[PDB]
């Protein structure tokens, strides 16, 4: 979303997941997942970087 004084409001989701080991479930097996996730709302100037 663009605002008047040269700024942005961002609704952000950024993830990086992978396939993990195969664990034991009941008499069966299944695959687990390894995750990294961040979700936020931030307010940042037009052409510069921020660390979330």
């Amino acid at each position: 979303q663009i605002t008047p004084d040269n700024r942005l409001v961002l609704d952000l989701s950024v993830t990086q997941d992978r396939r993990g080991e195969t664990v034991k479930t009941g008499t069966g097996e299944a695959v687990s997942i390894d995750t990294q996730r961040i979700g936020t709302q931030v307010l940042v100037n037009n052409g510069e970087t921020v660390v979330l």
Binding site: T3, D5, R7, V42, L43
Partner: protein, 52 residues
């Protein structure tokens, strides 16, 4: 009067854990076996029956 820019906050958590441990054990194992002629000394009854 409502729509105005808002502030931003930075939050940082810190989890610290420390562990220590010590262990010590002492033990002894000894035995004897002797005969004299019609006289014996051991560490069980099967022992005296064997040294014959």
């Amino acid at each position: 009067s409502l729509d105005i820019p808002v502030k931003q906050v930075q939050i940082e958590a810190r989890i610290v854990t420390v562990k220590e441990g010590n262990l010590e054990e002492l033990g002894v194992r000894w035995g004897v076996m002797s005969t004299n002629g019609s006289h014996s000394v051991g560490g069980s009854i099967e022992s005296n029956l064997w040294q014959k």
